[PDB]
Paper text:
[name] functions in myeloid cells during innate immune responses to activate NF-κB and p38 MAPK. [name] and [name] share an N-terminal domain architecture comprising an N-terminal [name] followed by ~300 residues with high coiled-coil propensity, referred to as the coiled-coil domain. Upon activation, both [name] and [name] recruit the same downstream binding partner, B-cell lymphoma/leukemia 10 (Bcl10), which interacts through its own [name] with the [name] of [name] or [name], a [name]–[name] interaction critical for subsequent signal propagation and NF-κB activation. The CARDs of [name] or [name] are thought to form a nucleating helical template that promotes polymerization of Bcl10 via the Bcl10 [name], which, along with other domains of activated [name]/11, then recruits downstream factors, including MALT1, cIAPs, TRAF6, and the LUBAC complex that mediate subsequent ubiquitination of multiple members of the complex, including both linear and K63-linked poly-ubiquitination of Bcl1013–16.
We found that CARD92−152/I107E spontaneously formed filaments after a short incubation at elevated temperatures, which are readily visible by negative-stain electron microscopy (NS-EM). With the CARD92−152/I107E construct, however, we found that the filaments now remained predominantly singular when frozen shortly after inducing filament formation. With this sample, we were able to generate a 4.0-Å reconstruction of the [name] [name] filament. The coiled-coil domain is disordered relative to the [name] core, such that the reconstruction contains only [name] residues 8–95. The [name] adopts the canonical helical architecture of a death domain, with helical symmetry of a 5.11 Å rise and 101.6° left-handed rotation, consistent with a growing body of literature demonstrating a narrow range of parameters adopted by helical assemblies of CARDs (4.85–5.13 Å rise and 100.2°−101.6° left-handed rotation) including that of Bcl1036,38–41. As is typical of this architecture, the [name] utilizes three [name]-[name] interfaces, known as the Type I, Type II, and Type III interfaces, corresponding to the 3-, 4-, and 1-start helical symmetries, respectively. As detailed in Fig. 6c, interactions within the interfaces are predominantly electrostatic in nature, consistent with our previous observation that increasing salt concentration can inhibit assembly. As monitored by A350 and NS-EM, mutation of residues in the Type I (E15R, R35E, D66R), Type II (R29D), or Type III (D43R, K58D) interfaces completely blocked filament formation when tested up to a 1 mM concentration. The exception is the flexible α3-α4 loop, which adopts a ‘closed’’ conformation in the NMR structure, but an “open” conformation in the filament, stabilized by interactions across the Type III interface.
Numbering used by the authors:
A (entry chain J), B (entry chain I), C (entry chain H), D (entry chain B), E (entry chain E), F (entry chain G), ...: 8 to 95
Write the structure that this text describes.
Amino acid sequence: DECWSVLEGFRVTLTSVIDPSRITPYLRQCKVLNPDDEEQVLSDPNLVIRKRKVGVLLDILQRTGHKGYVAFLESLELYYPQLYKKVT
Amino acid sequence: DECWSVLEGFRVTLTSVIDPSRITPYLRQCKVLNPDDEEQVLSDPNLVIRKRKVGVLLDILQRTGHKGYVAFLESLELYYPQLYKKVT
Amino acid sequence: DECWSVLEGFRVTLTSVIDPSRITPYLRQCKVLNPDDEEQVLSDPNLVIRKRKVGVLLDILQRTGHKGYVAFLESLELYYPQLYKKVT
Amino acid sequence: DECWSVLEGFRVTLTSVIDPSRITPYLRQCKVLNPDDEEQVLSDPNLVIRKRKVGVLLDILQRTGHKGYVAFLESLELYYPQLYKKVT
Amino acid sequence: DECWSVLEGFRVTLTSVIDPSRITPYLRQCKVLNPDDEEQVLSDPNLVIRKRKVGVLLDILQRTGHKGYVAFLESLELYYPQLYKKVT
Amino acid sequence: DECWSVLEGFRVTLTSVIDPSRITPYLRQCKVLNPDDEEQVLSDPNLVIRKRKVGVLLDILQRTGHKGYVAFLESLELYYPQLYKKVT
Amino acid sequence: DECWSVLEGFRVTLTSVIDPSRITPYLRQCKVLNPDDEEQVLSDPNLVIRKRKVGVLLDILQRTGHKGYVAFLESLELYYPQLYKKVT
Amino acid sequence: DECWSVLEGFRVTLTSVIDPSRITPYLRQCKVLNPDDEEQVLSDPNLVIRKRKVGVLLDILQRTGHKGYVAFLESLELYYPQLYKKVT
Amino acid sequence: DECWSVLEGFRVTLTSVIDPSRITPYLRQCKVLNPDDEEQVLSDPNLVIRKRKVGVLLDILQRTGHKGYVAFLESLELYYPQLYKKVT
Amino acid sequence: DECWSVLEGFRVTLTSVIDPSRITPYLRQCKVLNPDDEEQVLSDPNLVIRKRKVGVLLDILQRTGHKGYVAFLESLELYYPQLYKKVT
């Protein structure tokens, strides 16, 4: 691992800003997630504030390592450039 | 029994393809299920992926024998013909 | 007590017909229940058929006596008149 | 007694098919069980497979005689007719 | 006897694999055990590893002869076929 | 310790007001909790009133000392200022 | 003592009505119980009917005297006023 | 005495039917038993079948006379009416 | 055996990554598990962190040998290829 | 030995803080414990406070020497760093 245990250093910022409906497909084509986990992220009558969703998604990525990390990171510097800069 | 213990031979295919919101009423009129089990299949804040639902429904039918089997089978060859062919 | 041990004589009818989302507030203002018990009745990922809910609510009222009985009864003859008639 | 010691002749079938959440209230109004035993049947973090539950319930009825037997039997021929036929 | 004193030749395999919560009812209907011994097998705050339980059950059957032996054996070839094959 | 054994002096107020879904991430980045304990706090089909949850969370923090105390305290004076004032 | 040996005069009423999940925290801040005894009251896979729980809690308070008595009593006249009146 | 030496005439029926967790508190308030004997009845890792428990309890009552007899009897005609009728 | 006693060499990785709701059906059709064990894995109000679940499932497979091992292994190289590579 | 007889110098701190459900698997792969002892640690209807559990586990490790000591120690400095520092 060695990467998530540090990126997590700041998580409130992400959980507040980022949104899933854009990140999901690019990841999907970089072959990380499966359909089921996506539908669990999005359609669920229990978690609604939009923040629990990001929490679940970010944890599902943490369960995977370097690969999913790179996918997430590249997606991020492609969509949210100033946030990527803040990360680095 | 003698029937479910073989039809189960292939279950992934069904659990992936089939969906409940169509099968439920035809069965309902062939007098197998009750309202309560139907609402349990559908409205439940715990199981969401759409696959656990099919699992529960298929098990509720397994709990009953030849009768429910014939109902399910006829419904299936009425809606999903190529899948019925695959079964046979 | 002397009242619930007889009203219980017929319970299937109630558990089938009545629904909580209407009875709850009127009781709430007749000062019987507390918020916590209400949320336990309604939001719980274990009991879903709508009938276990009525069971729990009716038992929570049985735990209290004449007071809650009168509250429930008056609510009932205010909302469900023909069912009240059946009770009497 | 003279009745349970024979009905027990076939118990696997029942323990597999029957379910409690329907039988419980009708019995409850035929005045056999008490609340405590019901909650013990249902809410218990030790026994989960759904079969131990039916075992406990059926034994609690065996502890009582002709009365509970008739209650159980009538409930059964009211809900599960083909299973009643199998019994007779 | 003449049967248990040989079947015991291999006991570790059974005590490791088999589990009671399935065998118990079929035996129960073949009229070997009584309720009390069953509850002693299962609910006891002293023996917990799951292996002492099988030990006690298997000994309770040894206390009885040909009859209980046949019951156990038939149950076994009905549930655990490859284990029955290993026995024979 | 020397701190929790006094802050506990008033606990009803907290257990009534505070809610977890906001406190959890800030703590998470101050590196106190782990994912598992978080999921135990939130997703559990036994404890539902919202108060047992706060109880468990507050105890999990008590199990840790000065560090978790400071984290909790700073989070609190960042989100709930008047409640922090009441604490001091 | 001189107090519990009389309050016990009526115990069925309490053991039926009262519930722990509300009384526990107020007592906890009046510094009577410890965490361990609380978790023993609540989470235990042996005692389930809700009544054994109240029994254990009430005995744990009896083990302590005037102090715990006053705590329990004040909690009670704060939550259950008509029951307090019945006590007096 | 003159009473127990006759009521004992039929003991199997009681030892089979009755259960302690209900009788114990009413007796407790009629001031017959002490806490210690109650805990001995219930929590003991040696006697488990539920029948030895009733045996011990019934003997502890026999050790006392007319008083405990009346307590037991009244409790019984309050909970188990048909069994009381069988006694008389 | 000779296989599990080595595959266990690394267990933290699996217990962290793998999840049951996907593995369960494929195994189910390779005829290893029974319904009861599946429901025990999934629906149980005691074990919640998602890790105890994998522990129980993996042990239930260990109780069986070469057969269940091959089933698990093939499922794994069908769903989680990089994890299979890590295994080999 | 020469190691446990000193580490025991402070035991209250450990028995209060540490928890088993995390330590168990890492040890399990360092090949110290067996399944049976693990299930005895966790699932037992007698010991519940969470502290007796740690006591039993720590003693089971003491029964083994240098090997289990090193396993426990490394696990600890991998999960609980500040507690490891306190140890050293």
